[PDB]
Amino acid sequence: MIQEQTMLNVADNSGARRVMCIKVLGGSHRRYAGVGDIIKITIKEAIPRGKVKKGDVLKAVVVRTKKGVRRPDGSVIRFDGNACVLLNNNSEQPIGTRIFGPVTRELRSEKFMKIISLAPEV
Amino acid sequence: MRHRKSGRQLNRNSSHRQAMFRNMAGSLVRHEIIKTTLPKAKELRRVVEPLITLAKTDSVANRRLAFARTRDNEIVAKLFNELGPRFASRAGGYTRILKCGFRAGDNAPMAYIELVDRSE
Amino acid sequence: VYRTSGAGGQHVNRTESAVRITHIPTGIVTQCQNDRSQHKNKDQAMKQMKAKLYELEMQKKN
Amino acid sequence: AVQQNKPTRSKRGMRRSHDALTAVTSLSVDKTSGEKHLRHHITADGYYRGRKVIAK
RNA sequence: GCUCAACGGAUAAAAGGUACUCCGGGGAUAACAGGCUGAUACCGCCCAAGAGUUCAUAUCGACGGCGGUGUUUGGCACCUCGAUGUCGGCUCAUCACAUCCUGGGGCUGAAGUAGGUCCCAAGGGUAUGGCUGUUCGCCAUUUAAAGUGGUACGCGAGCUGGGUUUAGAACGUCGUGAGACAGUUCGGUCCCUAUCUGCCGUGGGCGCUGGAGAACUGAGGGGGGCUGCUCCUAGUACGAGAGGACCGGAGUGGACGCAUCACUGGUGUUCGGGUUGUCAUGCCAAUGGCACUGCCCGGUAGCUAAAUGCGGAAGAGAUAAGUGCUGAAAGCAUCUAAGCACGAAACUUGCCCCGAGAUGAGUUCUCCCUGACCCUUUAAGGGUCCUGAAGGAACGUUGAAGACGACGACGUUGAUAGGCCGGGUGUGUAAGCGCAGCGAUGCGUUGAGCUAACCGGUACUAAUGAACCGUGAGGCUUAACCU
RNA sequence: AAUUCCUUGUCGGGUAAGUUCCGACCUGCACGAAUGGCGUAAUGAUGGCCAGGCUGUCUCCACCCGAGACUCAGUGAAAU
RNA sequence: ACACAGGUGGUCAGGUAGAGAAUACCAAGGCGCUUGAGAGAACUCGGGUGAAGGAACUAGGCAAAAUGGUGCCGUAACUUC
RNA sequence: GCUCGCCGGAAGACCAAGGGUUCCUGUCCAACGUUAAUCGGGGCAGGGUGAGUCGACCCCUAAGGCGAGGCCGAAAGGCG
RNA sequence: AGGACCGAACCGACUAAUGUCGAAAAAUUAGCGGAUGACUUGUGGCUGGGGGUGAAAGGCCAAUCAAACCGGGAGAUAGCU
């Protein structure tokens, strides 16, 4: 459950701190984000020596949710926080090489095996 | 949409509503026979039958608890002393409601409320 | 056409057909309001098409 | 909002025809004192079910 | 003869602003919409060579021509100036196809993936936002696609005044001056309880023609109709490297609708506790009241959603364009004039719901009604006494049922509601007492105490047995069967 | 620009997007030195543009507490 | 023109907390507003709380919500100091 | 009467302004009261206000009024 | 000391809601501005209709203001209804 205008926290590398959504991707008049949903973000806070800087559009796929998930047998896994990892929006590549903070079992959907390799938790 | 709502607010707001039964039940045990509006007795009986039920087993803490309810010691000088003793055999069922008529003021349903014992 | 409110009394509601004409494989639009008539507003829009179009080519010749 | 006509007296009565008060048609005589009283009520002097349980 | 700019000159002396306005008016005379027409706009065709490597039919299709619709601007003043009273947006719709995808296809300057163009087509979807009041428009980000219009430029007896018009004020320009505007800048009473028709629900009376209580058939009607990605088939067919399938099957989301509180939460002023100030029972403890439950922390049954499931068809008949088969008018050709077969999210149905007041008042099952007399147009007449049926209604306890009605459960051949018992759930160690200690306070008894709508039981209390209505054998005619 | 109809004039900042906003160019329809010009701390129930926090404005509302609304008894209107 | 949520000069004005006549609960005194009894539908108004995000709403952060008191350290641009 | 709630630098207790018996008792319910009313600020009869020390009247002054004298102006009248 | 500031009574009325055949022929509720002055109020008087007064709107003059109110001109006049 992530929409536009949502100020999450960066939990990966590539030199951002704060970002915010302008567009829920995915579908024809889709209005919500799943746990590993694709989200067109722009950058609202970046470190000075970082790769990208403030105010530039890209795709980014969410991971952590204040709403959390449900387990398919029915357990909620709530994360006190919301995290997202960046994407190379013209070639869909997660540019994350260093990610800290837990991830989701539901994220194992084989576009993310580079991500869950770098997972230090869950 | 009142699906399983065990309450009748009686067109009275809350703080007046609870105190309505607080003053009534004390007057109810006071003369053992009163007369009131028909829906009012159809809710007070869900209160006073517990009030006998707490007087069924006596404690000084219950006497303290029954002063926290209804705030009158002469009432609990009357309760736990005749009624609670005499309704010890009776488990459930403590008043009796019968229908007198209608109020001369503006046609309000008038019913008698008294106990099953009624002192004689 | 784009339409806009104006000035009037107690009841007024009419909005005027104001015209906006462009030359599409070059891009430049022409909206002109200095005459109020159906094709004649185009006859100043085309007047101010070719004038602004000639306003291009003059400074190039400099 | 108002009628632009006047409503006739017929449709007045056609509106009014659904409005009879009642007939009680259920009369409970007291077993003791013959008081034809209201079913499930006490009598006027207070009998019920062949009993003076009014305790008046 | 001064003398009539307006020359039958109203004496030969006479210019404006009113949007501060006011009065008598006109649709006689303007603006919005409506009406007739269709110059203009838009759309569909007629001829025709040229550019196009060969070639007018892939397009533009000129120099010109024939018509259609009524959405642009106008033309005419037909209707209203004894008010037709607001642009746009929020919201809610809704139809016609000249169609944005989608399905069925012809052709290709479509090799393939993927596009261009034309026809059938309303069935479904037909964006979220920044700046201006702007619909418009510029622009960013997705998906399959962000379709053109009609409907007082849909919707103001639903909303806002933001725009735009009054009473105030400010700027610039024209004018001798008031004031005005191809202009712009702040703030500016926006009313109305719905008689009828209309529409969505919900009942009564009569009717259903012997009465009552139930179960269905079924015309008609409405809702539903969007699909994306991936894998198998097969990285086979095709192709100039590079690229890369329709069909059939399976899996899985978005948005919309219906249904559900078990699961994830929210509320829960009827269940507990905490705590600030303060009043009261003499003081304190234990408690109660007030300050929006004073501020609060949680929580049962319920209720709603983001939560949990399901639908989007397939198929049968005929189809629209189209593909045909054999074969004519014309010895042959040709889907054609006979006949037959395939082929659209489009129609009848299929899936579900309302439903026989569909007067054509339908079908089946069950229960009940079988006493004498008077006047008599001997009529489908009325009436007294005697029985009061099957059932309903009334009344009372009530429902996860509900505005009042209605439907369902119960009325003793008894568990409908309340209270209560065991338990459950929630709040977390009540009160009193003992010890440590200057003290507050802590610890032990103590998973115990307090416990609303919840589960299984319990006639202890309240639903009194009766009464009111409703009948006393189904008319006339005709026909095949029987004393 | 409270002053520019054309015009949203033209470059950068703010911004994913920026007719309004902050500076500069000057092409001032029709700024201008007491119809005062250019700045100005304090000040304003003054207009406009953003950031922080916060919340139901919104995505999409849900539940709850009362005065009415619904029935019954009493009086019984009004515009047209 | 009404038994009308409006308006009207002078005096007295306590207890506790509190800087204060601010405020909360009460004392003295005076009253419960002259239509009520039930129901708990739509919807309107007066209000509370709210999961994820937080102006994405809108003419505009308007209405709401939040912030809110005393002491201590410290406090920039600018400035008529 | 017994419980509960409300205002409490006032929804309270006294005066002046102004209204004008509305103040008290007995009796009564047609009319007044948005309902009934043996109730009342309703009808009827009767009663109630006691001052050398309270207020006012009284004596003395400002704004302002009238204003013999007087001046002015058609008269009225105006000013002083 | 403060036409200083925060803020009751008092005066005024910024925004939104309610109301419009309303509680009321401009008010109520929650927050607001001033609150040591150009402040506010009580009592007694003065200036007046083509004038008065005016921190200037052409606002107000007894709920009746680009001209109040009452009586008489006058039964104005009206090719307008």
Curated annotation (Swiss-Prot), chain B:
One of its GO terms (molecular function) is structural constituent of ribosome. The keyword Disulfide bond does not apply. One of its GO terms (cellular component) is cytosolic large ribosomal subunit. PROSITE patterns: RIBOSOMAL_L17. It comes from the Bacteria. The keyword Ribonucleoprotein applies. Keywords: Ribonucleoprotein, Ribosomal protein. GO terms for biological process: translation. Coiled coil: none annotated. NCBIfam families: L17 (TIGR00059). Belongs to the bacterial ribosomal protein bL17 family. Part of the 50S ribosomal subunit. Contacts protein L32. This is Large ribosomal subunit protein bL17. It comes from Escherichia coli O81 (strain ED1a).
